Amino acid sequence: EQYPVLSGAEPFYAENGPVGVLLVHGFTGTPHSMRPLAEAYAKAGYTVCLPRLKGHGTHYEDMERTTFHDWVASVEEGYGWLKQRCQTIFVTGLSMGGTLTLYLAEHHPDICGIVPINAAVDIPAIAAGMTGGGELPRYLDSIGSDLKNPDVKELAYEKTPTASLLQLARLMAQTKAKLDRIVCPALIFVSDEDHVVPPGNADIIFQGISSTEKEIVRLRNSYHVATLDYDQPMIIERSLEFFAKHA
Ligand SMILES: *[P@](=O)(CCCN=[N+]=[N-])OCCCCCCCCCCCCCCCC
C-alpha cells in the first residue's frame, strides 16, 4: 500500500472499560464516517476499535490490489485487539462495514451483539452494471455521496476499481448465505431513503438471522451515510442503550 493515509482516515483506538465495541467503516470509505460514534462510545466508558480497512483511506489504486479477505483480516485484527482486553464485544458497521459486521458474527458466536447500519448483502446495481453489454473500465467513477445534511462531506474515493466491486459482491454473497448462523442480539438501522444500499436489505438480514432478539430501527431524516447524517444522535443513543442492555 503505497499512498499516505488521508487526514481523518487514521484508525482510532481507546482502552477503557471491559466492554468493547468494534466499528467498521464502509466500501471505499474511511474511519471518518465511524469516528463520531467511536468517540461517543469511548466517552461512555467503552473500549473501542475503529480500524482502517486495508486499501482504504489512501488511494483507490491501493484498494484495487486488495481482496475481501484483506478487509476481513483488517477487521479480524481489530477484533483480536479487543479480545485481549475485553470479555464482551459488540460490533457495529456502516454499509460494507455492516456486511463485515454480519460476516464476523457468522464466525464468532462470542459476539455479544451486532449493530449493522444500512448493511449491504444484496446490491442489484452491481449485477446491472456488468450486464449492460458496454465496455467496463478498470476504474469506475464512484457513486455520489448520499447524505441528507448538505454541510457534511464524506471522505471517500473519487474512483472505484472494478476488481474491488467484484470482491464486494463475493463478500455479500458469502455473507448472505451464512446469515442463519448469527444468533446474537441484533440492532438493525436502515435509512428509508438510502440511494446506495436498497432499504430492503434490512428485511433480508432480519429474516435471515437466527437471532431471537432482533429489531429494525428505521431512520427518517438520513440518507445512506446515517452516522454523519441527521440521525447521528439517535444512532448513538440507541446503540448505548443496546450495549448497556446486553453488557
Ligand atoms: P457501503 O459499502 C459504503 C458506505 C460508506 N462508504 N462509503 N462511502 O456501500 C456499499 C457499496 C455498494 C456500491 C455499489 C454501487 C456501484 C454500482 C455501479 C456498478 C457499475 C459497475 C459494476 C460492474 C462491476 C462488475
Numbering used by the authors: 3 to 249
Task: Show sentences the authors wrote.
Monoacylglycerol lipases (MGLs) play an important role in lipid catabolism across all kingdoms of life by catalyzing the release of free fatty acids from monoacylglycerols. Here, we present a comprehensive study of five crystal structures of MGL from Bacillus sp. H257 in its free form and in complex with different substrate analogs and the natural substrate 1-lauroylglycerol. Crystallographic studies of MGLs have resulted in the determination of three-dimensional structures of human MGL (hMGL) and its ortholog from a moderately thermophilic soil bacterium Bacillus sp. H-257 (bMGL) in free form and in complex with inhibitors. Both MGLs possess the expected α/β-hydrolase core domain harboring a catalytic triad. The occurrence of different conformations reveals a high degree of conformational plasticity of the cap region.
Therefore, we determined crystal structures of bMGL in complex with ligands of different alkyl chain lengths (12, 14, and 16 carbons; subsequently referred to as Cx ligands, whereby x refers to the number of carbons in the alkyl chain) to mimic the MG substrates myristoyl-, palmitoyl-, and stearoylglycerol. The bMGL·C14 (palmitoylglycerol mimic) and bMGL·C16 (stearoylglycerol mimic) ligand complexes were crystallized under the same condition equally yielding crystals of space group P21. These structures were determined at resolutions of 1.85 and 2.2 Å, respectively. The bMGL complex structures with the C14 and C16 ligands bound in the active site show clear electron densities for all residues of the cap region. Interestingly, chains A and B of the bMGL·C14 and bMGL·C16 ligand complexes show a partially restricted binding pocket and an open glycerol exit hole similar to conformation II. Chains C and D of the bMGL-C14, and bMGL-C16 ligand structures show even more pronounced restriction of access to the binding pocket accompanied by the closure of the glycerol exit hole denoted as conformation III. The terminal carbon atoms of both the C14 and C16 alkyl chains are located at approximately the same distance from the surface of the protein, close to residues that line the entrance of the binding pocket. The C16 ligand is also fully accommodated in the binding pocket, despite the four additional CH2 groups, due to alkyl chain bending. The necessity for bending might explain the lower substrate turnover rate of bMGL with respect to MGs with a longer fatty acid chain.
